[PDB]
């Protein structure tokens, strides 16, 4: 039961290379606009505490060299939106797909197209960690890479890559330039807060297991939401909430297994381990599959 990424075609046709001075990074070209991290107008030393607003005032449209393939895209305007830079271009992207901009919620997942100076290198699936960071894979020049989800024909952009944390983790923003978590796009102390296990997804994963015929971990009992959190929180699990239980409704309806019955099973899985057994292969409890991903991959969309 692999972690699948959405096909990346619609997004590949939107990646461009943005170069301001000696700095280069990726850009998203939708219609007559290109979005890219604002720190593109920097050269290290500024980073310490650059006053972007004032560092942009000295910039002009010709200060920016946007490139799609070999062709050069003439920039006819520039503004700043929070941590992003909106560059207007004299040309509307003929490959612009139907899209939306949405702010993802902690624990939810998406696909990430890693890019290096305009060129899509690879694609992979990840989850927005509770601590508001993502455990991805970004080398040099991958800033501006984006995360997205697909629903039919509509591409929902939710993440744009900006910083890397000393933890080896990653910080970013939504397509409105606002960061996920406390992080700032400067060079400071800032570190990732401690992370927890996404209880909701682990639960979704178990339902998946039961759906494919892997159900040894099930039991005859149940539990109270309060009793489950007491156990779960010991094992460093996110507290489960009523709002979460309701998200599990469909899978629960599909399997006829009440969320709290499954919790009862999870509580036991946590206090006794798996005893060498396995679930859907893994020897550990997977927490990067949302209830939706389960519905997606199983009900073959």
């Amino acid at each position: 039961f692999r972690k699948m990424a959405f096909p990346s075609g619609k997004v590949e046709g939107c990646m461009v290379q943005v170069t301001c001075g000696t700095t280069t990074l990726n850009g998203l070209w939708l219609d007559d606009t290109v979005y890219c991290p604002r720190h593109v107008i920097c050269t290290a030393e500024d980073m310490l505490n650059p006053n972007y607003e004032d560092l942009l005032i000295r910039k002009s449209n010709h200060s920016f060299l946007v490139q799609a393939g070999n062709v050069q895209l003439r920039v006819i305007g520039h503004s700043m939106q929070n941590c992003l830079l909106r560059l207007k271009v004299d040309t509307s992207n003929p490959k612009t797909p139907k899209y939306k901009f949405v702010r993802i919620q902690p624990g939810q997942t998406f696909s990430v197209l890693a890019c290096y100076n305009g060129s899509p290198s690879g694609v992979y699936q990840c989850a927005m960690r509770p601590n508001h960071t993502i455990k991805g894979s970004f080398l040099n020049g991958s800033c501006g890479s984006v995360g997205f989800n697909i629903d039919y024909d509509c591409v929902s952009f939710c993440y744009m890559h900006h910083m890397e944390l000393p933890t080896g983790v990653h910080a970013g923003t939504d397509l409105e330039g606002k960061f996920y978590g406390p992080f700032v796009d400067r060079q400071t102390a800032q570190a990732a807060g401690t992370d927890t296990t996404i209880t909701l997804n682990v639960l979704a994963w178990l339902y998946a297991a039961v759906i494919n015929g892997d159900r040894w971990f099930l039991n005859r009992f149940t539990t109270t939401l309060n009793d489950f959190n007491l156990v779960a929180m010991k094992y460093n699990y996110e507290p489960l909430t009523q709002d979460h239980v309701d998200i599990l409704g469909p899978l629960s309806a599909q399997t006829g297994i009440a969320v709290l019955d499954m919790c009862a099973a999870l509580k036991e899985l946590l206090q006794n381990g798996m005893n060498g057994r396995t679930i859907l292969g893994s020897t550990i409890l997977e927490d990067e599959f949302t209830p939706f991903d389960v519905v997606r991959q199983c009900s073959g969309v």
Partner: peptide, 5 residues
């Protein structure tokens, strides 16, 4: 905290 990445 790398920022160019």
């Amino acid at each position: 905290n790398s920022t160019l990445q």
